[PDB]
Write a protein that binds this ligand. Sequence first.
Ligand SMILES: [Cl-]
Ligand SMILES: [Cl-]
Ligand SMILES: [Cl-]
Ligand code: NA
Length: 124
Amino acid sequence: KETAAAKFERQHMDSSTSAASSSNYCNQMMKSRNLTKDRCKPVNTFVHESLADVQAVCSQKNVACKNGQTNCYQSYSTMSITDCRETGSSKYPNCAYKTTQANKHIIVACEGNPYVPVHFDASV
Ligand SMILES: [Cl-]
Ligand SMILES: [Cl-]
Ligand SMILES: [Cl-]
Ligand code: NA
């Protein structure tokens, strides 16, 4: 039974690469992080920064989350991210994703002690 912090790491952290360099990145990563077991997760963002740099966002700019909660934080600097989105032809179990690499600010919701990211809200 995964903790919220561990689920965030599994779904969103990829410090092993600086950026997605292939159109197939999302297909491979969505599968290896077990996000296509039982259903295709329709949208997911991976962050290519160190875990410490992403945890540090919980001490940066406090902003509202999309849902109206006030425990969201926007990174002061841009970060390397990859957006993974199902294509229109995708359907379980042959999940298919479009890979879009970008450099953007990230917005995360933080909770707990230690106070760490538990939800990826958006990128700007
Ligand atoms: Cl897993
Ligand atoms: Cl996401
Ligand atoms: Cl402020
Ligand atoms: Na947690």
